[PDB]
Amino acid sequence: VPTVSVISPEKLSASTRRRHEIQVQTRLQTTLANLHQKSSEIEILAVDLPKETILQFLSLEWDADEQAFNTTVKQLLSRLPKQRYLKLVCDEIYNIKVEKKVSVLFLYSYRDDYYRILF
Amino acid sequence: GTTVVPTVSVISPEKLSASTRRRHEIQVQTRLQTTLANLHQKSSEIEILAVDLPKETILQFLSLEWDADEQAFNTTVKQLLSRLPKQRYLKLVCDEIYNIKVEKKVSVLFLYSYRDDYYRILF
């Protein structure tokens, strides 16, 4: 059970605050449990894409099932100009994050000298 | 314990000469050295931060830079806040992220929308 805190736009009652705390702890139980099925390896994926696109790739969901991954790929690809290259980038992310389960993937644009970490 | 050579894959829109591929590999392996080194500076703690923001805003927060300066963090905060409607709440959320990720050096932070039931991990 990790440290948790709630920060809300308006004042919260003690009971609303504890319900959110329990709600989120519960919804994350499975994910947290799975956290240890990951290998401690670090990989880098170097791509020719602008910073803004690297950011879009962070919406990919690689910590659920295959359907969730595929859905987020479909959504990502539908919101960007059609390009086979984007799909190939997603495939490699799938291989690295899902198949090989690597905990720390640096997604780095060699064009823009910009990275984000897919954990 | 000084220079780390992480595995690297170059994926290019068009065929890459062995020499171009090499150049890109050295570029990214070099540029990431500092980052990779400070990777053992992080504590093994996991933390959750629950917020009332939609998925789209959660995703925007992933642009914050917490692995360098307080300066680099504050710069990404200003950019983030400048592209969303003015709201004290946003800065308050940013402040807690700073404390968790930079001050306490927490490695795994779940940023969780209790409105949309949507999280992303800030590592």
Side-chain angles (χ1 to χ4, degrees):
Chain A
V1 180
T3 303
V4 63
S5 76
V6 179
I7 175 158
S8 50
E10 297 91 36
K11 253 196 196 173
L12 295 183
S13 63
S15 53
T16 305
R17 174 180 301 276
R18 174 61 49 83
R19 169 174 55 83
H20 287 137
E21 292 168 337
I22 307 315
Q23 158 199 3
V24 57
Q25 285 285 10
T26 301
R27 270 143 227 282
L28 296 180
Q29 283 196 246
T30 287
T31 299
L32 293 157
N34 287 168
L35 233 47
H36 291 86
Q37 304 190 160
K38 311 255 214 195
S39 71
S40 289
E41 264 279 327
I42 290 172
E43 288 201 40
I44 298 164
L45 178 63
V47 293
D48 196 349
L49 297 170
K51 159 178 177 174
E52 297 66 19
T53 312
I54 299 300
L55 288 166
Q56 296 304 317
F57 272 87
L58 303 182
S59 67
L60 295 184
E61 287 169 25
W62 54 76
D63 50 5
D65 55 11
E66 201 185 327
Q67 174 65 56
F69 190 84
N70 293 155
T71 301
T72 55
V73 170
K74 190 169 188 164
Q75 295 174 142
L76 170 53
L77 292 177
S78 63
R79 292 172 182 188
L80 294 162
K82 142 215 65 182
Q83 206 171 84
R84 288 59 56 191
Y85 178 56
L86 255 22
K87 180 78 209 77
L88 298 178
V89 174
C90 296
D91 288 338
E92 204 59 53
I93 291 172
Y94 178 84
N95 172 51
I96 295 175
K97 293 298 296 179
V98 178
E99 277 165 343
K100 304 202 263 198
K101 303 220 171 77
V102 341
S103 58
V104 181
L105 171 62
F106 284 83
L107 178 61
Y108 172 93
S109 160
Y110 56 82
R111 174 85 80 152
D112 272 3
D113 186 38
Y114 182 87
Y115 77 83
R116 295 282 76 186
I117 289 173
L118 282 61
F119 182 93
Chain B
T2 188
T3 287
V4 280
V5 180
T7 332
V8 43
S9 309
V10 183
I11 300 291
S12 281
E14 271 136 293
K15 189 69 172 181
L16 234 53
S17 52
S19 68
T20 302
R21 174 189 291 279
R22 174 179 170 281
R23 185 170 57 89
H24 289 148
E25 291 187 3
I26 292 165
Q27 175 192 340
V28 67
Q29 288 171 142
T30 298
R31 294 306 280 119
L32 262 22
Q33 281 301 309
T34 305
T35 307
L36 292 157
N38 296 159
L39 225 55
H40 304 94
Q41 298 301 113
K42 293 179 168 170
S43 87
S44 321
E45 310 160 340
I46 302 173
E47 185 162 348
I48 303 158
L49 179 60
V51 296
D52 185 7
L53 297 173
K55 155 176 182 181
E56 292 72 13
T57 310
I58 298 306
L59 289 163
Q60 289 271 7
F61 273 71
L62 298 181
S63 71
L64 296 176
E65 300 177 5
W66 54 75
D67 29 23
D69 258 85
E70 174 180 7
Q71 197 175 313
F73 183 90
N74 288 344
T75 292
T76 56
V77 171
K78 296 231 199 72
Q79 305 179 281
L80 175 65
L81 296 187
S82 76
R83 301 166 185 265
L84 296 165
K86 164 74 167 276
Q87 185 181 175
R88 174 66 190 287
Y89 184 55
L90 262 24
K91 180 53 156 66
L92 293 182
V93 174
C94 284
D95 285 345
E96 303 287 312
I97 293 173
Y98 177 76
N99 179 241
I100 296 167
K101 292 298 311 187
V102 180
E103 275 171 342
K104 304 159 61 182
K105 304 294 189 193
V106 169
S107 54
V108 178
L109 167 65
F110 286 85
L111 181 58
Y112 190 92
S113 171
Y114 57 75
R115 161 144 309 183
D116 283 1
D117 183 39
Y118 180 85
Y119 74 89
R120 299 277 73 191
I121 298 170
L122 286 63
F123 183 90

